[PDB]
Design a protein around this ligand. Structure first.
Ligand code: UP6
Ligand code: UP6
Lengths: 218, 218
């Protein structure tokens, strides 16, 4: 996956007008948008097609899929029907639940991103101690796309070690949650950025600024 | 605690609006509590919650297995309660801050959180099971009153009941299709969640009636 400027916009505004306007304001800087439940539950799944119509951007559905295999399959099918290119799936519920997602993605020509360790403090309680094993499970299952924590570059580096340089790794927690764009890109292929851009007085200037700060990394 | 008719909660995971409405209407005399999840919501929109309220005299539990960072969890809960859900199901494995975020919104908005501890599917053994007692104890410490545990593992369901105490409200999934027995499960759970055994039956009303007849003494 070729992400323009190594920068993925996390569009978590919950109003269609604002979401479309802000995304439009930064469109020259991105070609990949992560859409999650805040926007989808507020405005409907049709918003995904609307983003593709307006911006032609690729869409990663950050739905943290975390159900039993049967329900996971249905979730993935509904999501890809709406035009998502990829979906983010939790690994904590185990291999069968991940495989269910991999099956649908293969069937519809899409990608699964396996979330291994999360960026927030609560991730330390249970997720962090399982994270390496979750990553090895991804490797065993043939997962090629992963998500790890910008807020813990040592943990992000370990995740990269496990999955290898061939796998694709994106990372959340940049900016608002404290992660640094350039440091995160030592290990991740692309950074996810939400509030630092979409809550900024001038989102285009914010995006431009982040890109300037990583200009030597492409 | 919520008064669940016949101790039976329908898991309405049909993805077609017409079918979902038909089947739910057919079993309405037996069930006043419906669990609506992402298969239906991502297919038909959050307005499906409104439609169920209008058509049936049923409480709505949104099974969204909320599993994000606190900031995103808050937004998901707000959107879900705004749409008319009485309660939402939240994962504990992302840790205490993530759960607290949901509890805070539920308190502010006058609704309820159900904490999912151990899941019913085979993959739950890989990571969730080993964390489940601690997740339950965490729920108790956070003041969580409503919980979800696995019908498929009576021994684990019994232990979860012990941890949360007799005053807490416990519902349980994995009954029927996944192998759980209604009667045994109700030794420990206040109510059972049943999906496919009802909604895939030639006669869903007869299926629900049969389940209820099998537990009449309870
Ligand atoms: O471990 C994770 C996984 N996903 N996200 C998601 O990435 C985005 C981060 O946005 P932010 O830059 O505003 O913090 C949000 O959509 C959040 O749900 C994280 O923050 N951390
Ligand atoms: O641990 C859990 C938690 N939730 N569910 C949910 O409960 C329902 C079970 O439906 P079923 O009776 O068709 O198996 C489905 O909506 C599934 O997502 C489980 O099955 N197991």
């Amino acid at each position: 996956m070729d992400v323009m400027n190594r920068l993925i916009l996390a569009m978590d505004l919950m109003n269609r007008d604002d979401a479309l306007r802000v995304t439009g304001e930064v469109r020259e800087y991105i070609d990949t948008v992560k859409i999650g439940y805040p926007l989808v539950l507020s405005e409907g799944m049709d918003i995904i097609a609307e983003f593709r119509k307006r911006f032609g951007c690729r869409i990663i559905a950050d739905f943290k899929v975390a159900d039993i295999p049967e329900t996971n399959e249905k979730i993935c099918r509904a999501t890809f029907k709406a035009g998502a290119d990829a979906i983010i799936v939790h690994g904590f519920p185990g291999a069968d639940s991940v495989r269910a997602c991999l099956n649908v993605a293969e069937e519809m020509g899409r990608e699964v991103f396996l979330l291994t360790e999360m960026s927030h403090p609560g991730a330390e309680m249970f997720i962090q101690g399982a994270a390496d094993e979750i990553a090895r499970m991804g490797v065993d299952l043939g997962v090629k796309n992963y998500v790890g924590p910008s807020t813990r570059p040592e943990r992000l580096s370990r995740l990269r070690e496990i999955i290898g340089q061939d796998s694709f790794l994106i990372s959340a927690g940049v900016g608002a949650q404290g992660g640094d764009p350039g440091e995160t890109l030592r290990f991740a292929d692309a950074i996810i950025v939400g509030r630092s851009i979409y809550l900024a007085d001038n989102p285009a200037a914010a995006a431009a600024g982040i890109i300037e700060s990583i200009k030597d990394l492409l």
